[PDB]
Design a binder for these strands. Structure first.
Ligand SMILES: [Cl-]
Ligand SMILES: [Mn+2]
Length: 175
DNA sequence: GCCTTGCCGGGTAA
DNA sequence: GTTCCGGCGCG
DNA sequence: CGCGCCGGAACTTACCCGGCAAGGC
C-alpha cells in the first residue's frame, strides 16, 4: 500500500533523526510524541511534513503537525497517542516488513543516518540488532555489507555497504 | 596506481 | 535526540 | 481525579564527516 511505504520511510527518519516518546507529567498528565528533528527547517516544511500530513489525514488523526525551533535544530512533532502506537507497533513488527517497506525504511534510515556524501555508503547506529536486520534485507537484495563497531567512544556501530554494489544500492534503494 | 574499507578524532546536528 | 515545564481540554 | 494535546525549553550525546593507512588486484 501507499501508506505502508510512506510509513516505513517516516519510521526510518524517526528512528534515525527523532523518536517516539511516552511522556508522564505531574500530576498524572501524559503525552505521546512522534518526532523527527533536523537542521533545516526547509527540509522539514517542504519534504517531511507533507508526508506526515498525508499519513495523519489517512488515519484520521486529530493532532496537528507542530514545527518547533530548538537551539540546535528544528523539531517536527505530532502529539498523538494514536500516531505514537501506530509507529511503535510498526517498529515491533519490523522483521516482517515486505520488500516495499524494507526499501522505504532503509531509504529513511539512510537519509537520516547515512553517509549522504555518497563517496562511501555507510549507516550509523548504536542498535546492532537493528543493523543486522537491515544487513540481511540488503544481502537479500544483492547488496553486500559489513558491520563493525565504528565509534568506541559512544558504542556506535556502522553498517558499511560494499562499493562493489554501489550502483545496485543507489539505484535500488535510494531510487 | 588505484580502489576499498577498518580505524578514530572533531564537533554539530541531532 | 530526550524529558522537563506550565498550560489547556475533557469525561 | 485521571489523562491526553499544545508550545516551549533545557538538557545530553549519537551520529556523520573525513583524513589515514593496510590489504588486495
Ligand atoms: Cl530492534
Ligand atoms: Mn541526520
Amino acid at each position: 500500500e501507499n501508506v505502508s511505504g510512506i510509513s516505513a520511510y517516516l519510521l526510518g527518519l524517526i528512528i534515525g533523526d527523532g523518536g517516539l516518546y511516552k511522556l508522564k507529567y505531574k500530576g498524572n498528565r501524559s503525552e505521546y510524541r512522534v518526532v523527527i528533528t533536523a537542521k533545516s527547517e526547509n527540509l522539514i516544511k517542504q519534504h517531511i511534513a507533507p508526508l506526515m500530513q498525508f499519513l495523519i489525514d489517512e488515519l484520521n488523526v486529530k493532532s496537528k503537525i507542530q514545527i518547533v525551533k530548538g537551539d540546535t535544530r528544528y523539531e517536527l512533532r505530532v502529539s498523538s497517542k494514536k500516531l505514537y502506537y501506530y509507529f511503535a507497533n510498526m517498529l515491533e513488527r519490523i522483521r516482517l516488513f515486505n520488500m516495499r517497506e524494507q526499501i522505504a525504511f532503509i531509504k529513511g534510515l539512510y537519509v537520516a543516518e547515512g553517509d549522504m556524501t555518497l563517496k562511501r555508503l555507510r549507516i550509523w547506529n548504536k542498535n546492532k540488532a537493528l543493523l543486522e536486520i537491515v544487513s540481511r534485507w540488503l544481502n537479500n537484495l544483492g547488496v553486500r555489507n559489513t558491520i563493525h563497531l565504528d565509534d568506541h567512544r559512544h558504542g556506535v556501530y556502522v553498517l558499511n555497504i560494499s562499493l562493489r554494489d554501489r550502483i545496485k544500492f543507489v539505484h535500488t534503494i535510494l531510487s
